[PDB]
C-alpha cells in the first residue's frame, strides 16, 4: 500500500493531456539509464493490458540537473561527508575518489 501511495504521488507529479486521457512526464536520466528505462517501459506497458507504445522524446535543450554520483557500500560514506559540505556543480570534478 505504501508503494501504491508512492505511485499515486508520482502520478500526481505530471501534466494531464487534453487531446487524449494521457499524461506527459519529464525525467532527467543519463543515457545508460535511458536505455534501461526504454526496456523497462516495454516491460511496464506489457504488464498493462493496453501495451501503449509510451513514446519518450529526448530533449536537446539541457536544464541545470541534479548531481548524480554512483556510490557503493564502501564509497557511499565518503560521498556523504563530501555532500555534507555541499552538492557539487553538474559535471564538476568529484572530490570523493580522492577523499
Amino acid at each position: 500500500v505504501r508503494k501504491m501511495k508512492a505511485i499515486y504521488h508520482t502520478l500526481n507529479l505530471c501534466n494531464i493531456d487534453v487531446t487524449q486521457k494521457c499524461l506527459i512526464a519529464e525525467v532527467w536520466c543519463p543515457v545508460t539509464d535511458l536505455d534501461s528505462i526504454q526496456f523497462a517501459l516495454r516491460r511496464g506497458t506489457e504488464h498493462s493490458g493496453s501495451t501503449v507504445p509510451s513514446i519518450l522524446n529526448r530533449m536537446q535543450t539541457n536544464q541545470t540537473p541534479p548531481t548524480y554520483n554512483k556510490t557503493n557500500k564502501f564509497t557511499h560514506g565518503f560521498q556523504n561527508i563530501v555532500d555534507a559540505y555541499g552538492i557539487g556543480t553538474y559535471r564538476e570534478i568529484n572530490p570523493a575518489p580522492y577523499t
Binding site: 493531456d17 487531446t19 487524449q20 522524446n57 530533449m59
Partner: protein, 57 residues
Amino acid sequence: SQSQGIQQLLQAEKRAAEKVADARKRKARRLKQAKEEAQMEVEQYRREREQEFQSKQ
C-alpha cells in the same frame, strides 16, 4: 520535436471533435427525415385503407 508531436495530436483531437459534432448534426437531420417519411407513410396507409373501404363498401 515533442512540441510538434503534441500539436499534431491537438490537430487530431480537433478533428475528432469535429467528426462527432458532425455526427450529432447528421443525427438531427436523420430525425427530421424520419418525421417527413413518417408522414409520407401515413398518407400511403390512409390510401390503402381508403381503397379497402371502398372495395368493402
